Amino acid sequence: AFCNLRRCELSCRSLGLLGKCIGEKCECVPY
Numbered sequence: 001a002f003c004n005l006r007r008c009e010l011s012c013r014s015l016g017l018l019g020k021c022i023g024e025k026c027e028c029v030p031y
Contacts, residue, residue: 008019008026017028 003021003024003026005019005021008021008028010019011026012019012028015028017030020027020029
């Protein structure tokens with residue numbers, strides 16, 4: 001099913017950065 005963006009954000013929040021949905025998948029923003 002389509003990517004949960006809010007779940008991806010919280011999963012990146014563990015490290016201290018936000019999340020991006022990238023095709024059924026999740027990556028984070030180390031800017």
